């Protein structure tokens, strides 16, 4: 799996983005 | 009789061999000989061997015809010891692995029934019967799959035929029907009218329920042949 690993990497960035937004909001 | 008269080490330094006597139904009533520590300690010698079950081929039990009974085993459980010779009564009957594997073939229907019949003695036995249906003599299709109506008919027929060939039968009468394979032959004639069947046979009849104190049955299956 190489494209699914890219999708997993995006989902983790998307999840870190939502925790970061919460800290600054 | 090979250790009481012989020299062998540690465990077998002190041991004796006691006979195993099969029921009167069989022809060669010897099963074999059993190593058991001689009467020593809290247990008594022939008090250990009474609970040991002995499995012997029906072909060995009845010498004379070997293709018949050659692949069918008889389970025999010691039920009492008389004169130092343990006597055994039916503990079940099992077709052996070579004869279970032989029947299954690609393309044909398979039928398995599970039947519980209580004996007059008090032994409810689970009888397992296998059936396959082949082609109707010359048939257009090599595969032999048949209609479901005549599949339930085979299944309902087996339970009814099993009641018919095993009514109020005591263990002697049950064993004798498995002695000559009479019941399976009857199964050929019950399902004969419907689509041709093959290997209609009793694979197993396991004793499920055992009443204690069946010394009555043990005498019946060891010496009531002379009366009957």
């Amino acid at each position: 799996m190489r494209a699914k690993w890219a999708k997993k990497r995006m989902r983790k960035l998307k999840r870190k983005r939502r925790h970061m937004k919460a800290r600054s909001k | 009789k090979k250790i009481t008269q012989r020299k062998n080490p540690d465990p077998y330094l002190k041991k004796e061999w006691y006979p195993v006597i099969a029921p009167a139904h069989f022809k060669s009533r010897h099963i074999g000989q059993t190593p058991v520590t001689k009467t020593a300690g809290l247990r008594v010698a022939t008090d250990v061997i009474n609970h040991r079950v002995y499995e012997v081929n029906l072909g060995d039990l009845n010498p004379g015809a070997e293709d018949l009974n050659g692949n069918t085993k008889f389970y025999l459980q010691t039920q009492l010891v008389s004169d130092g010779k343990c006597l055994t009564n039916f503990h079940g009957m099992d077709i052996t692995r070579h004869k279970y594997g032989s029947l299954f073939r690609k393309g044909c229907d398979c039928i398995d029934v599970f039947m519980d019949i209580p004996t007059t003695d008090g032994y409810l036995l689970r009888v397992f019967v296998i059936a396959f249906t082949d082609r109707f003599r010359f048939q257009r299709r090599k595969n032999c799959h048949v209609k479901g109506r005549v599949i339930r008919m085979m299944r309902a027929g087996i339970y009814e035929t099993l009641h018919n060939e095993l009514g109020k039968v005591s263990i002697p009468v049950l064993v004798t029907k498995l002695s000559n394979f009479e019941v399976n032959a009857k199964l050929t004639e019950a399902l004969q009218k419907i689509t041709m069947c093959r290997d209609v046979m009793i694979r197993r009849v396991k004793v499920v329920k055992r009443p204690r104190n069946t010394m009555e049955l043990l005498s019946t299956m060891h010496d009531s042949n002379q009366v009957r």
Binding site: - | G59, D60, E66, D67, G70, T96, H98, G101, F104, K106
Partner: protein, 97 residues
């Protein structure tokens, strides 16, 4: 490209088949992508052909024969040579050899 029309499986009209495991790999391949070649052989090797029957006391006893289907995975089979890599023309022919 579609190497084969069956797409590598015999699954037809179902959409699902019961899954078993390679005897060797233990890889789970649905029943349709399974080698499954039926095996029937004498239990002692035919090298002990009649040496056993001459040793056997009981008259007319036939050496027991196993009747087991062997189910292998596609990957395990090509490396164990149960089936080879056929040519484009060769693939269509069936006729069990």
């Amino acid at each position: 490209p579609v190497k084969r029309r069956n797409n590598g499986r015999s699954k037809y009209n179902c959409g699902h088949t019961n899954i078993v495991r390679c005897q060797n790999c233990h890889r789970c391949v649905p029943k349709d992508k399974v080698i499954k070649r039926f095996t029937i052989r004498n239990i002692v090797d035919n090298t002990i052909a009649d040496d056993v029957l001459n040793a056997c006391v009981i008259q007319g006893f036939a050496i027991p024969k196993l009747y087991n289907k062997v189910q292998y995975c596609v990957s395990c089979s090509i490396h164990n040579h149960i089936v080879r890599v056929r040519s484009r023309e060769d693939r269509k022919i069936r006729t069990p050899p």
